[PDB]
Each structure stands twice: as C-alpha cells, then as structure tokens.
Amino acid sequence: KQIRKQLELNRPDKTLWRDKVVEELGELRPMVSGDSDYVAAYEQLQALVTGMRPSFPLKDLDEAARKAGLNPKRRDMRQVNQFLTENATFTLKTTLQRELPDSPLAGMKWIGLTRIEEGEGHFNTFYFVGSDKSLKPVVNRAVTLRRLLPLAGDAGIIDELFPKLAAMMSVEFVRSGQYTVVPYPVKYLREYWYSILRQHPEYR
C-alpha cells in the first residue's frame, strides 16, 4: 500500500497545476527548516516551477529540475525529494530504494527473526534472508521464510542460537555475492553427501 502511495506521488504522467503547485510549495516552505544547501535547493525548485506553463506533466518538472542541476543523486536534492514524498502531493524522486527507519521494503533487505502467532499460543518462529546490497528497481524472487522448531529444549534455544546462525549466514563463499539462507555447514554436508552419491548408486 505504501509503495502504491509513493509511486502515485512519483507517477511521471501525473498532470499538475502551476498555480496549485506553487501555492502548495509556498505553504510548505516554513516546514523545510534544514541546512543551507537543502533550503537553497528547495527555494531553487520553488522558483523553477513558475517557469513552465500553467499545466504540465510531472516529467516536464523533472526534466526542468535535472537540467537546472537538481540531480537526485546529490545530497541536497535527496532531502528535498524526501520532504516532498512525506508532505507534498508530488515528488520528483521516491524514497523507496533508500534505507529509511520504517521502509515499506522491510524484510527484503536484511536478516531478522519473526514470531508469527499462527493461531493461539503456538508462537511459531521464523526468519528471513534479504539482499545485503541496496535493492534494484526490480526484484525477481521473493524471500522465503524458514521455520525454527525446537525439537529438544525450551523456547530459549532459538533466542540464544539465532545470532550464531545469522553469523554463519553472513558468508560469501556459499552463495555468490549474497547471504546464504541456511548456515554454511549445510554446504559442507551437501558436498560430502554428493561425494558419497558419486560412489553409491543405491542412494542416487
């Protein structure tokens, strides 16, 4: 839902009214209150809007900003984009791929553990593994949830062993350039079992 809401704000062919946008930015001006470059970029964008025709698609504003030097990769323009995303009805760039305290892309980026109710009192435990790098515009595959079921011991087994499993899961040799969903000794076990299968067709 939040991804839809933000991409609606960043929609390219979204028509805008010059007078309405100018008035909205003027009213939002007091809320900026940042560093020198941030406020300077905000005022430059505010003064840029008046240049174009009374109505324009958001692509025209984006191209005008890019030509005027408001490259989204810059540190000042990024804060303006974030401010517009949080408070304005439009934004030149969306803060989706950015790492934010509460991102809508949560769970697809890091290793964490969850506690799903799954009914009454079972307290089923799961964990996920996400890509360490910043997410690319497209993500082909989802990230499955493994299950942590204590066969022996109390419920603290998970709470005391999960950091070790996560430490084993942050390795590069098992999976090329990514985390490994399972601990790395599973790779050793899989290779060792394949070595046996090479000599024992009874188990192939």
Binding site: D13, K14, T15, W17, R53, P54, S55
Partner: protein
C-alpha cells in the same frame, strides 16, 4: 471577389510569357473563389481564342463541370461555339468506361454508333470487362493487370468507333494487327467530318473523348492525379504524358487547393521511384560502353558530331575510365554468404546509412571476384563507390538530356509535319536505345535528370541560388539480392528519388504559367505545403503575389472582426485538463451525482481501455486512450450543460469503431448515461449523431439529417466525426428554429437583401477540436516501401528547411535501425504550422451565415492549445474564433526564432563540411572541381566577413549556381568574434550556445602572423585583410578550418622562402598539385599545418596519413621525397623531431619572432641538402 480582378490577374500572368511567373493567392474558403475564377477564365478564353487553361483540382467533386458550363452559357458572347467543343473534361479510364456504359444503358449514344454491329459487340465486351474490373476492385485486387485488361478493351472500342468514323468519312485505313497510324491529314478529315455532323452526335463524341481534338480545346478540367499522370490520344494506342506534351507550352494551369497538391505529387513520385529499379553494376557498365561507342565514330552523324563537340564529354569519359579501374567494376560482385537479413543501404545527402549491422565491405584475385561481404577486410571501398557511381550516373544523364534536347529541336525544325513531332521523352529514349541500353535501363536513366536544366543558354538578371541539398541531389537507396537465376553475381538493385514536388513544380514552370488558389496557399510549412522558401529562392521575381489584384472592399469584408465586436458575439474557449478520473470532468457546483455512478463509469472506462487491440510491442498505456475518452466526455458534459448550445460538432481524428480505441457503442452509452446524470433540465432533449464512412449513407446525407433534426425536430444534436471526413467546405448550416430565432445575432451588414438564404440560416454554435493525428509519418518498421520513403523524405524536408540538426537526424536513423520510434522534434515550425493549418481549416466552417449564437464555445485538450501557432499566417485573414483561440493560447507558447537560428547555423556548418568532404573525394579526378575548391578557399581568406550584396555579387557565387561552401553564418549583431563548442569534430557538428572554441582572426593566429616583419605587406598584396571588418555575414567553423589552412599555407610559404632564402616551387602537376603543398629540387616536400586548438589525440594517425601521402607521391614520381611538416604557431616549446618526415613545433611565437633559429636552421639545412 469580383470577376474583373481575376480577369486582370489572368492578363497579368499572360503578360509574363517569356519568364513564366508563378502566382499564389490566399483567400478564405467562404468566398466562392472557384466560381469567380471559372467565370473569369471562361470570359478570357472566349475573348482571346488562343489561350489555354488547365483547371487542375484534387478531388472529382471539385471539378465543377456544371459550373463551367453555366458560366460559359452566361458569358458566351453573342455568336458562340459549343461548350463541349472548347471546354472538355479529361476523365480517367475507369470513369470514361463508366460513363460510356451508362450512356449505352440510357441510349445517349447516337444512332451512327449504336446501329453498328461491330461497335455493339465491342461495347458488350467492354461492359463484360467492367463488370469484372468492378469485381476485381471489390476483391482480389492486384488491379494493375485488371487495368491493363480494361485499357485494352477500351482501346478496342475506340478502334471500332474510329473505324466506323473513317468509313463514314470516306477515309481508307491502310492495313499481327493493322497499322492504325492515321495520317495527320486523315485526322483532319475525321475532325472536319464530325464538325459537319449534327450537333448532338458531335457533342456526345466531344464529351466522351476530349482527346479527339485536344489542340482546339482551350480550358481543360482534370484532377491533379490525372494531370501529373499520362493521357491517351483518341487515335494513338499508347499514352502521352501531360508533363512532356507540347500542349503545355504557354498555358495557364490553375491549381485549386494549391497546397493540397503536394501530398498527391509526393506520393505519386514515391510510388514511381519505387516501381523502377535496376542493377547498378550492369547499368553503369553498359552506359560506359555506350559512351565509348560514341567516341569511336560508330554512332550516326547527328549524335556523334554533337556529343564530341564539348569537353564535358571527354571529362565524363575520363571519369568513367578511371572509376572502372578505381572500383574494378568490370568484374562481378558476389556476396557469397547468405545474409540473415540482406538489408538496404540508403544514401541521404547527409550520411550513408546501412539498415543493419556492420557496413558492407575486397578484391580477391585468386578467385578473381569481389566478395561484398561483412568482414573487416575491405580494399575497394564500397560505401564510397555507391555515391561515386550515383554522382557519375546523374552527371551523364544530365549531359545526355542536354544532347537529347539539342537533337529534338534539330529534328523538329527539320520536319514539316508540325502537328505530331518528337516531344523530348521520345528523344531521350531514342538516344539511350541507340547507345545500347534496354527499356528498363532507359527508364531508370531517364528518371534521373528528367527535365530540369538551365534551358540551353538563357541569360537572366536573376541568380537562382539555394542551399538546400535534398532538392538538388535527392536520396538513393540500394538493395542487394542473390537468386538461383544468377549465382555468379549479386544484383545491386538501385532505386533513386530526385523529383520532389517542388522540383516538379519548377519543371512545370519552365513551360507554363501556374496560378495557385488555396485558403492557406502561402502557409510556411514543408510537410503539407510546398517549400515556399525553396521556390522563392529559385524563382525570385517569378513568384508574384495575388493580393495586388483584389479590390480593397473584399479585403475589408474579409475581416469580420468589427462586425463580431459590434454585435456582441463573444467567443469563449474552454480547456480540458484531465488525468484518469471522471470526477474532474463533471461539474463541481452540483452534488446530485452519486459516487456509485461515477465509479461504474470509471470501471467501464477501464474495461474499454483494456480492450485495446494488441500492438507489435508498442505497449498500450491505458493512459492516452483514457485521456482522449475523458476529453470527449468533457465535451459531452459541456454540451449537455448549456441550453444555448443548439448545434455542436465534435472533431476527433479517429472515426469511432468496434475496437476499444474509439468504440461507437461505448460512446453512445456514455452519452446517454451522462445525459441522464447531469442533464436534469438543460439537456432533456439532446441527441448524439456520429457521422462517418462506417454508415451506409453519405456524409452530406447524415449531416443534413442531423441538421434537420435540429431545425424541424426541435432538439439539439451533437455531431462527432474526424478531421479528414468533413472536408474543406461541406458547410454545416441549418434553418433557424423558433427558440433559436428567439435569441441570436444577425451579423448581416445594413443593406443586404431581406430575402437571402445566408440570412435565413445559422452556423454552428460550438466545436470541439480533438488532437491532430499523424503529422510526421509514424511508421514501424522502416521497410523499403512507400511509408518508409515518405517518413525519410519528411525528415529530409525538415532538415532542408533548417528545423532539425544532424543530431536529431542521426538519433532518428538509429531509432529506425532498432525499430523504435523517437520523440518528435521539439522546435520545428513546419510541424506546428501544419497543426494550426488543420485547426484553421476545421474552424473555417463556422462563419458561413449572417446569424450567430451570442456565445460561441470552443473546447479542446491542452496539447491542442500548446501546438497552435501564429507565425506565417496573417491574423486578419483568419476566422475571428481562431483569433480568440490564439489570444487564449498566449500562455502555451514555444519560441521558434532562437532555436531555429541555432539549427540553421548548425545545418550550415554541417552542409559546408559535407561539401568539403565531397570535393576532397573528387579532388584529384576533375579539373573544374579543383579550380572551384581553390577559388572558394581564396575567397574564404579574402573575405572573412562579407555583406549579403557583396557575397551575392562575387564571381564564385555567381558561377556556382548553388551554395557550395559559400554558406556563411548570419552575423546578427555584426560581431567580429563568436565562440562555439565543437562536438564530433569529424562530423561538423557544433553547438553554438556552448563555448569552448574561438573562431576569430586572433584564434587563427592572424595577429601573431601580423607581428612577423614583412607578412603585412604580403597580405595586403594578396588582398588578404589583416583584421575582420564587421559585417552581416561571418564564416562557420567548417569554413574556418580551410581559412586556417590557407592562412597557414601562405604564411609558411613566405616565412620559409624568406628566412631560408630559397624558392619553394608549388607542385605544378595536377594530381599531386592538390595532394601536397610545395616541393623543392624534386626531393623534398613542405606541408605547413596551422591548427591552434589541435586535439593531440592519436598523432600517429597523422603520421600514418602523411606517410601514405608521401608513398603515393613517390609512386607517382618514382623518386625519393622527404616531407617537412611545420606548424606556423605554437604555444609550446619548440622541438624538431626527425624520422623522412621532419617536424617543427613552431616557427613564430605570439610576438612574431623566430623560435629556435640556430638548431632549426642547422637541422633543416643538414637534412635538406
């Protein structure tokens, strides 16, 4: 609007017979200019009895044969000739057959022919053929064959009637068929016999066949497509071409709807260019062998004597002889590999574009063949050879055309039978066949020079110069195909395209006066209207104007602004701004609308835009169709919410159909729902009628029925259609009803007749103008067909009119390479002028009655407001509502002047660079080209800044007859210095806005050159200025390169021949005269190189170039030569470096003093001696 003005205009045009001037007249459609010109033309033709006129229009219904006959009856003197005898309509073959059969059915045929059994049988056969041709048309097509069958049957019928005519006229026809070559005198007997016959049968014969006696015809009414095509004489079996017919001499062709003829002419030219193809290799070899055949005294007396009489013939012979050796064209080309896509190579005047992949490339002696393959190995340069062969073919064809005209005039003055003689298509074909070429070769080589020439030798006070290159060289594209029929060689199928519509009009203007009528005749667009700039440049005084021959009262009446203002007929425009929803297309003031109905409307809209027929990966964006639907429904809502909106005319560019793009049923259901939802009490009696070609009834029938529903029905209607459906004219006026008579405004001036139809009707109370369709052909993929050629010709037209730079052209060509369409040009005045022309033609049909609604409303999308313009078209000579629309479009504007000037500058630089590359390729072959290059460079140096008059008056400009390198920039502020930023320095592209490279005397080092003692006196001696006097024209960077080169050349010559006190003899041997600069004692070579900025990148490339030139020179002279390159000015420390190539960093510094006298003198003296 009076007949006397048009008669005086015709008299003025006829008074300019020796020059054949062209007349253009732009007047509003609501004046009946066609009727007035018909009356005036008929009066003049009746009065003079020696004057010819071709009334040429586009569509059949605009011929107005009945108007011509009624005008002839009204003003046909007091002793008169039959109208059918003088003024006749030249119909097409189909229409002629249709009329003949229809006359046979109602028995209009005279008893002389109907009683003939043989003619009855022939006519029965013709009817049987037409009943099939009809079906063929309606069915399997490939109608070319069908047409040949219909032509053969019609010729059989004509043979039957001429046979019976000769039988009744006591004329004996001499007789695997009889030679129906009736003697000129027999034609005379037939003509006088039908003259002596009763009026009815002679009238019928003249009406059904105008070609019976075409010489005695005075006014000929025929369509544009037929006029540019051929016609069949009544007796002769084959068909003569109107363009070459002697009947066009000293005629007056009238082009009704003058601007609309260009599309038809261009499409016909494209079709004929694609129809004719030939193998380049064979054609060239056979032509060269024929050119050798004439220069051995083997041809008859007439051709051989005239051909050898000029030096140009020997020059062409040498060109062909050296070209064959250069590209080894005596052998055959065999692309051995089976290409997954053979593709085609198009040669635009800008670049040599290849369809796919790596460009084609070597002689292979051990197999004794040329490969023509896609491998890195290439010796004989193909991409060079195709243009090189094309240019030689064009020159040879021009020469042959000149000799053919000479031979034609010779044989024509020789013969005594004037009535039927050689008409110059015959002469060219005869000469080509005498050379030894086939019919296809003759056609392809005759469609190259066609007829454009300098008219033998006729000196005139005007000079026809034009910098446009597409209209001088054209585009030629080649195809490679190999077939099991010819496994040994690979055919290079070449099709050319030279006859642009402007070129065709100019060729026509060489033999007949042209008068043009149109509402937008003088609109400056190169897409729909002729290239007015090109025509003006090539004509001069011959391009007259029409407004000088109209009464002032007509001009005053054209205004209509004062009347509208006085009677308080206010025009209000409403813009439509929608994104995806229905909520903003509905009135916000009301609230009775329940959100459920709006939600349902949005859901059906989403389904309909989902119904869009799959495209070839164009990726349906359900958004554009949603915008168009919402704009149409906003127009619907505005129409429904206004009781005074009696009549309305929606005008999209899509006729509603069954698909989801425009759905008739969906539109009707949405209209009904919106009526029930928002009408309430204002649109309780509205109705929507869609007029289109989909309905069986005619467009006029449906329009009349809807307007009747308005007038006598009592209900307001909404008419929806496309721009192309409702043609110019087709007035939409309806008889006034009681409510509409209760409130209106009678714009009629005081004193008009109360009993007048125009005062008893009303015009439309509002129009909706949808988005305009394809202006620049949008087509994918760029195949070798009519659509692709039309698109590339449109782009070339835009480039010549200085509206797109080479950057956009290259980007668009690359887009065609990957089958992905690009963005339309942002700053192209022709595009917006065409857009405004379409909208003006749409709006011109709302001011054709004296009574008007007190509030005319106009609704259109925002992009329509943005794309409209005012440049080129006079505001006073347009509809008042268009004036209001323009006034309301002041916010949405795109400036032309600055970007257009920048693009013109870049195009001038690119064209100069291309000209110099071309002359460099042809530098050592011809002597005239070398002289032109030398004179042009010396004029470059002698005149860094020149005035317009001083540039035109120059001898090089006068003699070149076109802008060859002499296309200076436009110095607006008379600046002596300007700065440009180079981009792709090897392609002549320069962004004039950006800085980074100086073009000035200081930049060329001319001041440092001045600081050397003695260089001033030499420069003033050679008339070379020491500083740039301010002037209105300045050099371009491509010109500045050769300016620098020649300046360095002369300065280095002087400095080296003064400091060393030895004479450097310039290379006086032609081929090496333009290859290297100077030599001395026959063993050393001196080549100075002045280049200041000098990107140091890949100096070893320059070494390879100079060593290759040195090797070529040594191979020429069989001697040891040593090259000493010298830079005249250097900002770096001097440092000679040896190798036989010698090197000198610099000679003079910015203070004009020698750099390293001792070491340099020692080294040069030691090595040279």
């Amino acid at each position: 609007m009076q007949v006397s003005d048009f008669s005086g205009m015709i008299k003025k045009l006829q008074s300019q017979s020796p020059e054949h001037a062209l007349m253009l007249l732009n007047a509003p459609t609501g004046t009946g200019k066609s009727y007035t010109i018909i009356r005036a033309l008929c009066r003049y033709a009746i009065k003079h009895e020696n004057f010819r006129a071709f009334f040429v229009t586009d569509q059949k219904k605009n011929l107005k044969e009945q108007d011509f006959e009624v005008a002839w009856r009204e003003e046909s003197g007091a002793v008169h000739k039959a109208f059918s005898e003088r003024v006749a309509v030249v119909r097409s073959l189909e229409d002629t057959v249709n009329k003949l059969i229809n006359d046979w059915d109602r028995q209009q045929i005279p008893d002389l022919y109907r009683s003939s059994p043989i003619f009855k049988k022939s006519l029965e056969n013709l009817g049987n053929a037409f009943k099939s041709f009809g079906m063929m048309k309606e069915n399997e097509f490939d109608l070319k064959n069908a047409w040949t069958m219909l032509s053969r049957a019609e010729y059989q019928v004509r043979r039957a009637m001429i046979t019976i005519l000769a039988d009744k006229a006591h004329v004996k026809l001499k007789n695997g068929a009889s030679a129906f070559k009736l003697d000129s005198i027999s034609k005379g007997k037939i003509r006088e016999f039908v003259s002596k016959q009763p009026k009815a049968d002679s009238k019928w014969l003249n009406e059904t066949y105008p070609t019976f006696d075409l010489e005695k015809k005075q006014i000929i009414i025929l369509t544009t497509a037929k006029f540019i095509k051929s016609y069949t004489p009544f007796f002769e079996k084959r068909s003569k071409a109107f363009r070459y017919s002697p009947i066009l001499k000293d005629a007056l062709v009238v082009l009704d709807e003058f601007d609309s003829t260009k599309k038809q002419i261009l499409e016909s030219a494209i079709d004929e260019a694609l129809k004719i193809q030939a193998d380049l290799n064979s054609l060239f070899v056979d032509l060269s062998k024929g050119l050798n055949k004439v220069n051995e005294g083997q041809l008859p007396a007439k051709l051989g004597k005239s051909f050898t009489f000029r030096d140009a013939f020997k020059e062409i012979l040498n060109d062909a002889e050296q070209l064959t050796a250069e590209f080894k064209l005596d052998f055959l080309y065999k692309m051995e590999e089976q290409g997954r896509d053979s593709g085609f190579v198009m040669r635009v005047p800008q670049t040599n574009w290849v369809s796919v992949g790596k460009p084609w490339n070597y002689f292979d002696e051990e197999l004794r063949q040329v490969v023509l393959g896609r491998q890195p190995r290439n010796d004989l340069n193909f991409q060079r050879m195709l243009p090189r062969i094309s240019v030689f073919l064009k020159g040879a064809t021009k020469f042959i055309l000149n000799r053919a005209r000479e031979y034609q005039v010779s044989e024509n003055q020789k013969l005594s039978s004037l009535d039927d003689a050689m008409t110059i298509e015959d002469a060219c074909f005869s000469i080509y066949a005498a050379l030894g070429l086939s019919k296809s070769q003759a056609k392809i080589l005759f469609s190259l020079g066609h007829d454009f020439s300098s008219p033998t030798k006729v000196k005139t006070t005007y000079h026809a110069h034009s910098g446009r290159r597409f209209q001088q060289r054209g585009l030629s594209l080649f195809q490679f195909t190999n077939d099991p029929q010819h496994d040994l060689q690979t055919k290079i199928n070449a099709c050319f395209f030279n006859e642009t519509p402007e070129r065709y009009l100019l060729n026509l203007l060489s033999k007949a006066n042209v008068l043009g009528l149109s509402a937008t005749a003088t609109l400056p667009t190169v897409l729909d209207n002729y290239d007015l700039g090109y025509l003006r440049e090539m004509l001069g005084p011959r391009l007259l104007d029409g407004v000088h021959y109209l009464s002032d009262t007509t001009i005053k009446e054209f205004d209509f602004e004062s009347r509208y203002a006085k009677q308080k007929i206010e025009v209000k425009v409403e813009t439509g701004i929608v994104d995806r929803f229905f909520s903003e297309i509905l009135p916000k003031n009301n609230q009775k609308i329940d959100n459920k109905k709006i939600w349902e409307l949005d859901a059906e809209l989403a389904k309909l835009v989902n119904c869009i027929p799959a495209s070839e990966q164009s990726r349906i964006d359900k958004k554009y169709f949603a915008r168009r639907y919402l704009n149409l429904f906003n127009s619907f809502v505005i129409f429904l919410t206004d009781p005074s909106m009696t009549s309305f005319l929606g005008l999209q560019s899509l006729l509603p159909g069954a698909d989801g793009r425009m759905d008739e049923n969906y539109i009707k259901e949405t209209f009904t729902t919106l009526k029930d939802l928002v009408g309430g009490q204002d649109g309780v009696n509205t109705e929507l009628r869609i007029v289109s070609s989909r309905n069986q009834e005619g467009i006029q029938e449906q329009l009349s029925e809807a307007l009747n529903l308005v007038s006598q029905g009592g209900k307001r209607v909404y008419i929806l259609s496309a721009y192309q459906t409702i043609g110019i004219g087709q007035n939409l006026q309806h008889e006034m009803n009681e409510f509409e008579r209760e409130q209106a405004a009678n714009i009629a001036p005081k004193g008009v007749s109360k009993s007048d139809r125009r005062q008893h009707t009303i015009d439309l109370a509002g129009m909706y103008l949808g988005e305009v369709t394809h202006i620049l052909s949008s087509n994918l993929p760029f195949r070798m067909d009519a659509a692709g050629l039309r698109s590339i010709i449109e782009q070339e037209y835009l480039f010549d009119a200085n509206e797109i730079n080479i950057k956009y052209l290259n980007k668009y060509l690359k887009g065609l390479q990957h089958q992905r369409l690009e963005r339309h040009p942002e700053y192209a005045r022709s595009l917006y002028v065409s857009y405004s022309r379409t909208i003006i033609q749409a709006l011109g049909r709302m001011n054709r009655s004296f009574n008007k609604m007190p509030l005319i409303r106009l609704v259109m999308p925002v992009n329509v407001l943005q794309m409209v313009t005012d440049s080129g078209i006079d505001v006073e000579k347009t509809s008042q509502e268009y004036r209001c629309l323009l006034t309301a479009a002041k916010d949405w504007e795109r400036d032309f002047e600055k970007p257009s000037a920048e693009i013109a500058k870049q195009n001038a630089t690119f064209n100069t660079f291309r000209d110099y590359r071309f002359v460099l390729a042809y530098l050592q072959t011809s002597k005239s080209w070398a002289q032109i290059y030398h004179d042009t460079r010396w004029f470059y140096v002698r005149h860094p800044t020149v005035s317009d008059k001083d540039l035109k008056s120059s001898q090089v400009f006068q003699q070149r007859d076109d802008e060859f390198g002499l296309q200076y920039l436009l110095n607006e502020h008379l600046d002596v210095s300007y700065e440009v930023k180079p981009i792709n320095h090897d392609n002549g592209q320069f962004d004039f806005s950006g800085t980074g490279m100086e073009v000035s005397a200081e930049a060329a080092g001319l001041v440092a050159m001045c600081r050397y003692p003695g260089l001033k006196e030499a420069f003033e001696s050679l008339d070379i200025p020491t500083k740039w006097e301010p002037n209105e024209r300045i050099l371009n960077p491509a010109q500045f390169y050769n300016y620098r080169g020649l300046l360095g050349e002369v300065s280095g010559q002087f400095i080296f021949q003064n400091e060393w006190s030895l004479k450097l003899a310039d290379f006086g041997k032609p081929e090496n005269y333009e290859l290297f600069d100077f030599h001395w004692e026959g063993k050393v070579v001196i080549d100075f190189k002045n280049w200041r900025d000098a990107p140091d990148v890949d100096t070893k490339a320059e070494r390879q170039k100079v060593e290759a030139k040195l090797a070529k020179l040594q191979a020429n002279t069989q001697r040891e030569w040593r090259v000493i390159i010298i830079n005249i000015l250097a900002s770096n420390q001097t440092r000679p470096v040896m190798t036989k190539i010698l090197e000198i960093s610099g000679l003079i510094d910015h203070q004009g003093k020698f750099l390293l006298t001792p070491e340099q003198k020692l080294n040069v003296w030691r090595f040279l001696n």
